[PDB]
Design a protein that fits this description.
The structure is a homohexamer. By secondary structure, chain A is mainly α. Chain A is built from eleven helices and no strands. Chain A starts with 9 loop residues before the first helix and ends with a helix. Chains A, B, C, D, E, F: This is Gag polyprotein.
Chain lengths: 213, 213, 213, 213, 213, 213
Amino acid sequence: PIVVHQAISPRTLNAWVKVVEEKAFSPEVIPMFSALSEGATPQDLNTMLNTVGGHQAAMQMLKETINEEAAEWDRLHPVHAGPIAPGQMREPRGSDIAGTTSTLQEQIGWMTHNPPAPVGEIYKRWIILGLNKIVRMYSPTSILDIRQGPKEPFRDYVDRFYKTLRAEQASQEVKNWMTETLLVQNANPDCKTILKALGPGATLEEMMTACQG
Amino acid sequence: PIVVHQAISPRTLNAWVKVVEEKAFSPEVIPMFSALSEGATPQDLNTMLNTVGGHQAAMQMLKETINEEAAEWDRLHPVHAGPIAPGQMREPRGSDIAGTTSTLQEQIGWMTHNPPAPVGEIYKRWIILGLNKIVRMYSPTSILDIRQGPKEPFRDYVDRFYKTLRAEQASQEVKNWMTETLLVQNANPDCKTILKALGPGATLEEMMTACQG
Amino acid sequence: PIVVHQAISPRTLNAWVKVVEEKAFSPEVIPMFSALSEGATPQDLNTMLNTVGGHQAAMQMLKETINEEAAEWDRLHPVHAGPIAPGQMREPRGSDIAGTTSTLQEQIGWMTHNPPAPVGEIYKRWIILGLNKIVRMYSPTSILDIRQGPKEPFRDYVDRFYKTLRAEQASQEVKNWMTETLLVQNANPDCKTILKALGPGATLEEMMTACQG
Amino acid sequence: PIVVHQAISPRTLNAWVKVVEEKAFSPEVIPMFSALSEGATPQDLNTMLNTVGGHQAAMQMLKETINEEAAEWDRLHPVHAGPIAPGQMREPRGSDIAGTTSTLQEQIGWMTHNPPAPVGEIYKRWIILGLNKIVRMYSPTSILDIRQGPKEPFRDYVDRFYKTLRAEQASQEVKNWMTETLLVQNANPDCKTILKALGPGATLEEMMTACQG
Amino acid sequence: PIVVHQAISPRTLNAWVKVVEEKAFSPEVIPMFSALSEGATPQDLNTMLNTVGGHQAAMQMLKETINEEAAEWDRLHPVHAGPIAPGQMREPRGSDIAGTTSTLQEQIGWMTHNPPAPVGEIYKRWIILGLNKIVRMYSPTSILDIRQGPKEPFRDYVDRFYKTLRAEQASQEVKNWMTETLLVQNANPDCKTILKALGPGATLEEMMTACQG
Amino acid sequence: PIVVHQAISPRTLNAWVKVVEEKAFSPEVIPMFSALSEGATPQDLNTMLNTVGGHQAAMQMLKETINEEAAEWDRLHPVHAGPIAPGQMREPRGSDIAGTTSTLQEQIGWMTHNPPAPVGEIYKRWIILGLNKIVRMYSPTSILDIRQGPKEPFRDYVDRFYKTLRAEQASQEVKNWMTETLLVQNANPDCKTILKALGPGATLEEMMTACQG
Ligand SMILES: [Cl-]
Ligand SMILES: [Cl-]
Ligand SMILES: [Cl-]
Ligand SMILES: [Cl-]
Ligand SMILES: [Cl-]
Ligand SMILES: [Cl-]
Ligand SMILES: [Cl-]
Ligand SMILES: [Cl-]
Ligand SMILES: [Cl-]
Ligand SMILES: [Cl-]
Ligand SMILES: [Cl-]
Ligand SMILES: [Cl-]
Ligand SMILES: [Cl-]
Ligand SMILES: [Cl-]
Ligand SMILES: [Cl-]
Ligand SMILES: [Cl-]
Ligand SMILES: [Cl-]
Ligand SMILES: [Cl-]
Ligand SMILES: [Cl-]
Ligand SMILES: [Cl-]
Ligand SMILES: [Cl-]
Ligand SMILES: [Cl-]
Ligand SMILES: [Cl-]
Ligand SMILES: [Cl-]
Ligand SMILES: [Cl-]
Ligand SMILES: [Cl-]
Ligand SMILES: [Cl-]
Ligand SMILES: [Cl-]
Ligand SMILES: [Cl-]
Ligand SMILES: [Cl-]
Ligand SMILES: [Cl-]
Ligand SMILES: [Cl-]
Ligand SMILES: [Cl-]
Ligand SMILES: [Cl-]
Ligand SMILES: [Cl-]
Ligand SMILES: [Cl-]
Ligand SMILES: [Cl-]
Ligand SMILES: [Cl-]
Ligand SMILES: [Cl-]
Ligand SMILES: [Cl-]
Ligand SMILES: [Cl-]
Ligand SMILES: [Cl-]
Ligand SMILES: [Cl-]
Ligand SMILES: [Cl-]
Ligand SMILES: [Cl-]
Ligand SMILES: [Cl-]
Ligand SMILES: [Cl-]
Ligand SMILES: [Cl-]
Ligand SMILES: [Cl-]
Ligand SMILES: [Cl-]
Ligand SMILES: [Cl-]
Ligand SMILES: [Cl-]
Ligand SMILES: [Cl-]
Ligand SMILES: [Cl-]
Ligand SMILES: [Cl-]
Ligand SMILES: [Cl-]
Ligand SMILES: [Cl-]
Ligand SMILES: [Cl-]
Ligand SMILES: [Cl-]
Ligand SMILES: [Cl-]
């Protein structure tokens, strides 16, 4: 990464390889990726993806998402013809952003320019977009199927509800509706009766402390 | 964090993920969070919360607490209309403090200004307030129910008393009353008689050495 | 490595030795090598290869590849006769690039010159070329033999397909043809019928979500 | 700590938490605490104590010792009334030294002043005084009860003697008397006879090599 | 080591102690030693050898090799008599190079002089010469005894061949002859017939892919 | 340590505690101590000794050795009476060198003076002298009792010989005599006959390769 260029640390590499081995494509793996790739060059970003053995269906899907985003970049940013002047960088293509047709020094060149061409952060967006698709697709449950069991503690139901919700393929407005409609609706008879008496203004804390006893 | 901006270390991330896995929401997890997040940007703070898989009922409660605090900030700090002058930062909203509508550079901008706008430390307050609510709520025992067993060493009773007390949802004045009233009252017959003979001026050390034999 | 010369870190050495022990010559070992050897001198590169015990057939093959590349370098770069002027470096031979006939200071000398003679990155190319040969040769499967089982989830078939494809000894144009022709052709009867109905324009995501149920 | 302020390292935190878990309040835990808290601010010192789960009887005793020392500081250092001048620090109270009524910047302010107000080292004294009380109180043995067994190697007896002595609640003059009187007196008949023949001028080395055979 | 003098890192020490415990005097232990001792002073080099418990026959042999080399140095470098001038270092003896009659500051003095007296790299040569003797002597097999089994995969035979070859006590010209003569000669009947048909121009890759089926 | 003063690292502390737990007072523990305490202040040196739990007979012996050396220092260095001038350090006593009557800043003061008063290296000498006494005393074998078994490989005998020799309480001239006289004398009949035929000029390598078959 760039803090001056610096090689990606052995501990960073190992941490990323381990989380993929241990947790596959659970939602929390994405902010971990983002955190381990802070200030990453495209080279560093490719290093992290390429160090993954297994899961090659997902890694292939990720490539295709990356290529779509790169093609969309090219459409919006047509490269102008001409010789590059002294002390200037060429305009980066989608493939340059993704690290395949640009060198490390060119990536250092773009990232440290005034004003910067933040190719690391652009490529990182595309990767996370692709990781989101994989997380959503590899989710085993739908939010409509999360229903509290007759002897299930409310805390356990809410844990499963919001785990599934975090994986759901929907915006925040839709997520608000899922919380507003389904959470109380799919609680068990006794807790569902208690929560309806609180009303639709109740906080999660209130709902949880209400169905505690 | 900021010491110059620095990426959050793999060891810091792993340490935080591990403590949540191992200890859930035991009281000691909060000073650990605070220690691992020293000089954290809002981005760093969101990274730590977002890297948690599981416990999504608590993580959702935390979001709601964060949103309440953000709304209260907005009420007390109405944003003034106008173009931002050269070499000045805009006034941060609650959502900017919580890292959702502000960039990393804006957070660096506020935190390193003269005088500083300490958005990292403000957001950290809100998070710890929310973690406190969770710790208190997830506590399995009340301080009124802590009673020394007939063959229980006094040290073991006092260990359970102050563990439960640390989790209790009360101020220091109330905690002083709990110590002043309940500790001796709920000791076993033989130790309770011994402690009443010491009187209400006795230190914990004195009380413990008295009920040793 | 050079960031100023720096000794190769114990953690870097151990990380490289471990990955060879654990994963042998799986495709992902190569980007790991590359990542652990960022800014490496030829001395550092020889250190990493020489620290491997076992697999000496592969390590010998690697030497021969290195020697071929070194001989090809010498052919293209005939050394000119004459005394080296003050504040100048001699032209490096293939053996100098590979670290056997050059000193550490000479490698520092070439790598930090204006303009640089990037002997570390040249030798690293030759090593990775040789590692590729080994990976390809040590692959146990051919892409033609990857066929979906009658009760095999499509995701598992695609995982095996692209794992084998990554090891295949072919260019990207050939790889595109392998994806275009074989993937659908060697799916099981029920999924193969479904994928033909999508057509040859379908993304991997689409193909995978189609054969999910 | 301060080396410039620096956040307490994850490895330091973990090392302290582990030693308390593993060794409880064995005498060697105190120099470990001191070593792990070198140049610590009061904030850092509270972080270390607060990260301890369990042992809350001891942690409460420690608080009370801290409060006694803070009250004694206040008595000896009455705060003078007046506005604090430009480029000056206020006089710290006991609660400021203990980190509860002072900010981190105020602690940095006192510790880096010319001349310094070493609030970190003052609070560290109070903590170690309190840890000593706990170690002494939690010791299971008295030095008077350490007696060499009839078939016990002298080295093993001396190991138990000085382990118990290190925990004893006594000054060095008293410790010298314990060594001068009890060590030889409570040896077994055969070794006790041998040691009396050496006389009271003998070194520990001499005493140990004498009772070897 | 010197990068300014720096103490040898705990991780470096532990890494060296572990490799000796785990791998004894396998050939790969030598480049590991060299890598862990980059820029080492003679003091650092003695630290590494002295931290080895066990294997004292080998460590004694190493001392004798070191003493031979030191005596040879003294013969070639007779020390000239006279007072050492201001801002000059004395000429180092063999014992000074080996760290026994020189101080740390004297070693820093020689290593950082203009031009340098590279006593660290000289002593490191002598140690590696001695380690080579030990590796060769402690090798359990001769290259003449490596013969392919009738059902042994060619890769396994070649692995054993070059493992034994790496330990052999011979120059590269002799090693070339061992490869040219023995490798094919001591293959099993079926593979030996196949390899003779390739001819003496064949690469190892070619020989291995030929005897694959 | 001092590299500027620096706190002793958690990894250094743990490494020292572990080696004492694992290896007790084996000869190799002493160079490990020395290596882990490079540039240590007396405070750092006391930290390392004080962090040891158990072995308090040895730790007490060490104190007594330290006190002897401190008393001898005082005898040779009588402190001169007078007020200390501006920008000067007082003459250190034995107790100041051992860290008990001097502060950390005073130790920094002496160690960084021009010319330096190397109190860290002086105290380190005294400690290692005391550790040597303990190693020698705690050795279970005498060099006179090391005799090759009738079916014992010569390498194993030589390993035991030099392990015991390293622990022996004797100078290098005496050690040379032990090697010259006992090693061959206490070999088994068949190897003893072979070694006498080599003569007293033979190297260890020669002796070992001679008794190999
Ligand atoms: Cl994986
Ligand atoms: Cl998965
Ligand atoms: Cl790759
Ligand atoms: Cl360009
Ligand atoms: Cl640009
Ligand atoms: Cl960027
Ligand atoms: Cl479900
Ligand atoms: Cl779930
Ligand atoms: Cl579920
Ligand atoms: Cl409803
Ligand atoms: Cl968790
Ligand atoms: Cl919980
Ligand atoms: Cl997230
Ligand atoms: Cl702004
Ligand atoms: Cl502002
Ligand atoms: Cl802040
Ligand atoms: Cl209870
Ligand atoms: Cl409890
Ligand atoms: Cl309880
Ligand atoms: Cl009462
Ligand atoms: Cl291996
Ligand atoms: Cl393999
Ligand atoms: Cl080698
Ligand atoms: Cl040159
Ligand atoms: Cl050049
Ligand atoms: Cl290079
Ligand atoms: Cl197959
Ligand atoms: Cl496969
Ligand atoms: Cl397969
Ligand atoms: Cl088809
Ligand atoms: Cl604990
Ligand atoms: Cl305890
Ligand atoms: Cl706390
Ligand atoms: Cl103030
Ligand atoms: Cl002040
Ligand atoms: Cl301080
Ligand atoms: Cl006892
Ligand atoms: Cl004991
Ligand atoms: Cl005992
Ligand atoms: Cl007596
Ligand atoms: Cl060993
Ligand atoms: Cl061996
Ligand atoms: Cl030694
Ligand atoms: Cl000199
Ligand atoms: Cl010189
Ligand atoms: Cl050198
Ligand atoms: Cl063999
Ligand atoms: Cl072999
Ligand atoms: Cl073999
Ligand atoms: Cl032949
Ligand atoms: Cl121990
Ligand atoms: Cl022992
Ligand atoms: Cl102590
Ligand atoms: Cl002074
Ligand atoms: Cl002085
Ligand atoms: Cl010193
Ligand atoms: Cl013996
Ligand atoms: Cl032995
Ligand atoms: Cl023995
Ligand atoms: Cl003899």
